[PDB]
Design a protein around this ligand. Structure first.
Ligand SMILES: Cc1ccc(C(=O)Nc2ccc(Oc3cc4cnn(C)c4cc3-c3cn[nH]c3)c(F)c2)c(=O)n1-c1ccc(F)cc1
Length: 283
């Protein structure tokens, strides 16, 4: 019999430009070991495993390897690879990048990502044994802002910026990412009403993310049900200042939630202002 393991992908059925872009980042099968018995996370769509990649020296590099589960049509493969390839264009320390793509003779293509020792940011900050300092939390927010300043300069709109979508590596470098209907409590008022997303709606979301950092990963608007959020915002109501949050940082959050998209600060101005806050907060 022909099993789920024996699937063969017809690359001639993909856009040739996608295949050629993938060519730029191909990882030979003999250079990758996937620890199929060490699942990092598993969804209905895909699964992520621990892996080891051998560099051109022959040294071992810990990585994360993303696969599709059961593949039944070419559009799922196309989507999967197109996502991976968007990351190829990113090169910034606060933006998640791709190590490469492996595709064997049979089976799912494999997207190979750097290993992020401390997982997602929201879980990290909620952990009592990590108990980050207020200073550390501001620092994380500045790193996110720097990654978003980069993305915005490339005209990439994130659409789901939130602490759950940022990851943390062994050097405590924050990498903006997207784990992949609507994240209503992170969305700008105009996006709730029109379902259009811009860099200025990412700024709103970043303000929410900052609030999550400073509350050590509290859920936003816990009292408000997700159908109630638009009314709350229409009345001019906003997330309240977290305990221990410096005043100038809360001022930054409020500015991010200005009802007029064009009066919100740019990521460049957020980087400057948060840098200033970080530099003067001694702790
Ligand atoms: C553009 C684009 C396309 C695709 C992605 C994407 O596929 N990201 C993605 C993210 C996490 C993933 O999962 C893990 C990876 C690692 C690594 N180490 N460790 C420990 C992990 C644990 C998990 C884990 C999964 N579940 N539970 C735990 C994962 F497989 C794929 C992405 O992020 N972007 C993007 C969007 C906007 C940006 F700014 C930059 C990139």
């Amino acid at each position: 019999p022909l099993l789920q393991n024996t699937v063969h992908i017809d690359l001639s059925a993909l856009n040739p430009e996608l295949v050629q872009a993938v060519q730029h980042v191909v990882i030979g099968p003999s250079s990758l070991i996937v620890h199929f018995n060490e699942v990092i996370g598993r969804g209905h769509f895909g699964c992520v495993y621990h892996g080891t990649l051998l560099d051109n020296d022959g040294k071992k590099i810990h990585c994360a390897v993303k696969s599709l589960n059961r593949i039944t049509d070419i559009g799922e493969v196309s989507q999967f690879l197109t996502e991976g390839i968007i990351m190829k264009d990113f090169s910034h320390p606060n933006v998640l990048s791709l190590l490469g793509i492996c595709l064997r003779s049979e089976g799912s293509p494999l997207v190979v990502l750097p290993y992020m020792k401390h997982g997602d940011l929201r879980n990290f900050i909620r952990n009592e044994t990590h108990n980050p300092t207020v200073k550390d939390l501001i620092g994380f927010g500045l790193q996110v802002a720097k990654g978003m300043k980069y993305l915005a300069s490339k005209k990439f709109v994130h659409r789901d910026l939130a602490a759950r979508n940022c990851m943390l590596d062994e050097k405590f470098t924050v990498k903006v990412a997207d784990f992949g209907k609507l994240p209503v409590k992170w969305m700008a008022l105009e996006s709730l009403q029109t379902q259009k997303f811009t860099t200025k709606s990412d700024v709103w979301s970043f303000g929410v993310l900052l609030w999550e950092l400073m509350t050590r990963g509290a859920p936003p608007y816990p009292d408000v049900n997700t159908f109630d959020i638009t009314v709350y915002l229409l009345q001019g109501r906003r997330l309240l200042q977290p305990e221990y949050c410096p005043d100038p940082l809360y001022e930054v959050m409020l500015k991010c939630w200005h009802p007029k998209a064009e009066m919100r600060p740019s990521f460049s101005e957020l980087v400057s202002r948060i840098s200033a806050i970080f530099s003067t907060f001694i702790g």
